[PDB]
């Protein structure tokens, strides 16, 4: 679904550094690719890093990525495949998660992505996520969690 994005939310330099787990998406992508771990390093206001994942069809994958950041949006570039390469806008910022939205080739009608600091986010985090989504005209009921990993949601 299309969000109502907040036009006053901008990415703070270095906010994306470190390890993240992409555990909730809309539409649900987890039958195609799952157990997504991201690691980002700062390059000025940009980032470089890696994304590792499990694919039922391709096996274990490791990808090198770049993020170029421009205000409330960034461009995501991956080396080997470009299924998820797109501009993504920030929808919500929290100490424990970020919510992004874009229209990549893999989900060209729109893809909302929730990146968590914790590998298995607990109920208090999910409650905050639900409120963040409502604030941008989205709804957790249209999202799927990654139930391929050792986490109950």
Ligand X SMILES: CCCCCC/C=C/CCCCCCCC(=O)O
Residue 98 found at the interface with ligand X (CB under 6 A): yes
Q: If binding is defined by CB under 6 A, does position 103 make contact with ligand X? A: no
Q: Is 116 in the site for ligand X (CB under 6 A)?
A: no
CA distances for 11 relative to 18, 58, 121, angstroms: 15, 33, 22
Cα distance between residue 35 and residue 147, in whole Å:
9
Binding to ligand X (CB under 6 A): which residues in 37-66?
51, 53, 63
Question: Do 148 and 34 touch, CB atoms closer than 8 A?
Answer: yes
Among 1-9, 79-87, 125-133, 139-147, which window interacts with ligand X (CB under 6 A)? 79-87
Tell me: is residue 53 an annotated ligand-binding position.
Answer: yes
Residue 24: closest CA among 98, 102, 91: 98
The answer to the question of residue 84 lying near ligand X (CB under 6 A) is yes
> In the window 7-36, what residues touch ligand X (CB under 6 A)?
16, 20, 22, 33, 36
What's the closest the beta carbon of residue 130 comes to ligand X, in angstroms? Answer: 19
Query: Between residues 48 and 151, which has the closer beta carbon with respect to ligand X?
Result: 48
Positions at the binding site for Zn(2+): 2, 53, 61, 63, 103, 150
Rule CB under 6 A: which residues touch ligand X?
16, 20, 22, 33, 36, 51, 53, 63, 67, 76, 78, 81, 83-84, 88, 98, 100, 113, 115
């Amino acid at each position: 679904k299309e969000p109502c994005p907040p036009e006053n939310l901008q990415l703070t330099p270095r906010a994306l550094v470190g390890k993240w787990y992409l555990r909730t998406t809309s539409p649900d992508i987890f039958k195609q690719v799952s157990n997504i771990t991201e690691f980002y390093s700062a390059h000025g206001n940009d980032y470089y890093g890696t994304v590792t994942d499990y694919s039922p069809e391709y096996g274990l994958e490791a990808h090198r990525v770049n993020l170029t950041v421009s205000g409330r949006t960034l461009k995501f570039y991956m080396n080997d495949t470009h299924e998820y390469d797109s501009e993504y806008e920030i929808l919500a910022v929290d100490k424990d998660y970020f919510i992004f939205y874009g229209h990549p080739p893999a989900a060209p009608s729109g893809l909302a992505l929730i990146h968590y600091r914790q590998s298995c986010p607990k109920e208090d985090i999910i409650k905050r996520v639900k409120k963040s989504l409502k604030n941008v005209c989205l709804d957790y009921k249209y999202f799927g969690n990654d139930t391929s990993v050792h986490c109950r949601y």
